Structure formats: structure tokens, C-alpha cells
Design a protein around this ligand. Structure first.
Ligand SMILES: *[C@@H]1O[C@H](CO)[C@@H](O[C@@H]2O[C@H](CO)[C@@H](O)[C@H](O)[C@H]2NC(C)=O)[C@H](O)[C@H]1NC(C)=O
Ligand SMILES: *[C@@H]1O[C@H](CO)[C@@H](O)[C@H](O)[C@H]1NC(C)=O
Lengths: 189, 13, 180
């Protein structure tokens, strides 16, 4: 199917700072990936983003009733919807599951990669640090970065490239909003 | 509670 | 900012496909099944805590459809440029033999929001227990999509997520097999 496609897309964003103390509402209209007109509650009128959107900015700005609908949106829409979903979105907390397993940068050589798997957690913000015998190791650390699983959970792999010596104890340390004390997992050579 | 919809408007014809 | 809630909607011709959804910090709260004209909560429990009038979504889609006709004329029937997706296959958690897990196929950074996705087990299409999301918004106005496949890890089975998109010349396969 090589028929041309034509896509009409619109979003309305509610941005929250300090709970609902400060709120910004942004309505956006797009055609084929080009944003052409928007309403920003900082301004309180529509503005053309491209020339193709100018007729609508002018047209919608001439409708005072529509404008006042949008000017109130931070209250009637943003703050309202925030409250509706607060208990299972804003207040959603799922503890990370932490495991450590050894791996290799090179298959023919010995295990030289300690993987700290941190998974199933919510929200997204996470901090993972590696320690060797109680001393933080900042060198040789590589990660997947934050992985979104698309299902209100996240994960990450944080890997330490190191040559384990007998008797060494490695510790993976995880900080996350669900805990007020770091989670730790030890791995021994 | 009930989620509120932002009602889109028709562009200029 | 602390949080962002996004309502995202589109209508696409000539496919006549439309979607309406709410996003919280990158996750889907719900979308509206256009066929059944019903709210579909991303996690089942959400529906016990909140509700939504799907007719509001249907009304917006009709507006989107009208706005599409207007814009297509204004732009002199300029077609959308295909942007092919990036595809990543991963598991829900570290893999252990004979321990139930889930394969995730993450389809990212593409437009238009139309894709064919097939899970392959040893080269064979599999549909048992599979699930998927609708098209999720991005800050750059391209789209995201997830497909899922529960599975029992083994040494004999290999998997691929096969993705077809008009921006791709051939289907894109991303592989997974047991890490040894
Ligand atoms: C997804 O697969 C469908 C089905 O194979 C594709 O739609 C077909 O396109 C051909 C032309 O290439 C038509 O002759 C068929 O009638 C279509 N099938 C229908 C309408 O059921 C579709 O193009 C694929 N989508 C992508 C993005 O590759
Ligand atoms: C569409 O065509 C008309 C007629 O030439 C032209 O004036 C107008 O600028 C075109 N619009 C775009 C978006 O190219």
C-alpha cells in the first residue's frame, strides 16, 4: 500500500509544578508532524506556529467563549484531572527488585562484568551505584539507561567492568522514591 | 472521579 | 516540572483510523476503543478508581476528521513523510531457564501510527498470550508502541519481533535468544 497518508493530531498538555500550586496548560494542533497552532496558558490566546496555522489562530482568537474555555483549563481540566488520578498515578510506588549476576565483555575471556539488574519499579527516577569492599567505584560503569516497559514499570541494567579477585565483595546500591534507605545487594568473587 | 475531556475545536473552513 | 498529563488524539486517512488516549509521565492511563466505544484502562484496577465518558473522545475524533479534511486542502494534499521505527526486544526481568518471563518489543520514533507486528518463535508466527498497546505520544510527535509475549525461557527456542512499516523497505526483525 503506497497510497499517501494524511495525519491530523492534537494534544493538550497539563504541566504541574509543586503539586497543583503552579499549573500550565498547552493545547497543540498538528498536521503531518508539523505543529501549526497552539494555545499556551502563559499567553491566553492561540498563536500560529507555522503560516498554515495562522487562519485558525485568528479564527479561534475571534471566539471569546472558546478562549475563556481554554483560559480556565488549568482549573477545570488540568487541576481536575490531576485530582481524579492522584491516588494511582502521583502516589503510585512500586519497589525495585535488585539482583546481581556476572557476565563477560569477551566470551573467550573470564567473567569481568558485574550486572546489577534493577527492575519492576515505579516511578522512573533511579540511582544505581557500585561499591568494591565498601568503596564506591565510578570507573568502568556502563548502563542500558532507564528502560520503560510501557506498563507502568521501569527497569535498568547497571554494569561494572572489573576483574574480580578472590575475597572481594561487590555491592550494588539502589536509591528510588519508594525507599528512604538504599537497597543493597552483595556479590562475592 | 471523572476525567474531563479537552474538547477540540474545528479549524477555519 | 513534577508531572505531565497529556491527552493525545489523531485521525488518519485513508485508513480512517482514530485514537484517543491519556498519558501520565510517559505511561498510558487509558484509551478509547473506537469500535466498542468504551474506555480501556491500561491497568485493570484504574477502572475501579476513576471513570471516563467515551462519547467525549468520539466527539473529538469527529473533529479531528473534519480538521484533517480542512488541513489536507490547505496544504495542497501534501502527504506525510514516512519515518521508520527503531525496534528493541528485551525481557521484563533477568532470564532464568524454565522461569516464566515476558518478551517486550518496543517500537519507537515512527510515523504514521500504522504498523504490523508479529512475534516469531523459531521462525513461526505465535499469538498465544500476546498483547499490545495503542500508539503512545512522544515529545517529538513521533509515536511509541509496545508488544508483549509471555514465554518459558529455554535453550531450544529463539524469538524475533518482526515489524512492518511503510518507511521500511523490508520487514525489520529484532532477535532474542538465551544469553549464555
Ligand atoms: C499490514 O498488513 C496489511 C495486510 O497484509 C497491509 O494491507 C494490505 O496492503 C495491500 C497492498 O500492499 C492490499 O492489497 C491489501 O488489501 C491490504 N490488506 C488489507 C486491506 O487487509 C498493510 O499495508 C500492512 N501495513 C504496513 C504498515 O505495512
Ligand atoms: C497551495 O497552493 C497554493 C496555490 O499555488 C499556494 O498559494 C499555497 O501557498 C500552497 N500551500 C502550501 C502549504 O504549499
Amino acid at each position: 500500500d503506497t497510497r499517501p497518508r494524511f495525519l491530523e493530531y492534537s494534544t493538550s498538555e497539563c504541566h504541574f509544578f509543586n503539586g497543583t500550586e503552579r499549573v500550565r496548560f498547552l493545547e497543540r494542533y498538528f498536521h503531518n508532524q508539523e505543529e501549526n497552532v497552539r494555545f499556551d496558558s502563559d499567553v491566553g490566546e492561540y498563536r500560529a506556529v507555522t503560516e498554515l496555522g495562522r487562519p485558525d489562530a485568528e479564527y479561534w482568537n475571534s471566539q471569546k467563549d472558546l478562549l475563556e474555555q481554554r483560559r480556565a483549563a488549568v482549573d477545570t481540566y488540568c487541576r481536575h484531572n490531576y485530582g481524579v488520578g492522584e491516588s494511582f498515578t502521583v502516589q503510585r510506588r512500586v519497589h525495585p527488585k535488585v539482583t546481581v549476576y556476572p557476565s563477560k565483555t569477551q566470551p573467550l575471556q573470564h567473567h569481568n562484568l558485574l550486572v546489577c539488574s534493577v527492575s519492576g519499579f515505579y516511578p522512573g527516577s533511579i540511582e544505581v551505584r557500585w561499591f568494591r569492599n565498601g568503596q564506591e567505584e565510578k570507573t568502568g560503569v556502563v548502563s542500558t539507561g532507564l528502560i520503560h516497559n510501557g506498563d507502568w514499570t521501569f527497569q535498568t541494567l547497571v554494569m561494572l567492568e572489573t576483574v574480580p579477585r578472590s575475597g572481594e565483595v561487590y555491592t550494588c546500591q539502589v536509591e528510588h522514591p519508594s525507599v528512604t534507605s538504599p537497597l543493597t545487594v552483595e556479590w562475592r568473587a | 472521579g471523572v476525567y474531563a475531556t479537552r474538547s477540540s475545536a474545528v479549524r477555519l473552513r | 516540572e513534577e508531572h505531565v498529563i497529556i491527552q493525545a488524539e489523531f485521525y488518519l486517512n485513508p485508513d480512517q483510523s482514530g485514537e484517543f488516549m491519556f498519558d501520565f509521565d510517559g505511561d498510558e492511563i487509558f484509551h478509547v476503543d473506537m469500535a466498542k466505544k468504551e474506555t480501556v484502562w491500561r491497568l485493570e484496577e484504574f477502572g475501579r478508581f476513576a471513570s471516563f465518558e467515551a462519547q467525549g473522545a468520539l466527539a473529538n475524533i469527529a473533529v479531528d476528521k473534519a480538521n484533517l479534511e480542512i488541513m489536507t486542502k490547505r496544504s495542497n494534499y501534501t502527504p506525510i513523510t514516512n519515518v521508520p521505527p527503531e525496534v528493541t526486544v528485551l525481557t521484563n526481568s533477568p532470564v532464568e531457564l524454565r522461569e516464566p518471563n515476558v518478551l517486550i518489543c518496543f517500537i519507537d520514533k515512527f510515523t504514521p501510527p500504522v504498523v504490523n507486528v508479529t512475534w516469531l518463535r523459531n521462525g513461526k508466527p505465535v499469538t498465544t498470550g500476546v498483547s499490545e498497546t495503542v500508539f503512545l505520544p512522544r515529545e517529538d510527535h513521533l509515536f511509541r508502541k509496545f508488544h508483549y509475549l509471555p514465554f518459558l525461557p529455554s535453550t531450544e527456542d529463539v524469538y524475533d519481533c518482526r515489524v512492518e512499516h511503510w518507511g521500511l523497505d523490508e520487514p525489520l526483525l529484532k532477535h532474542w535468544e538465551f544469553d549464555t
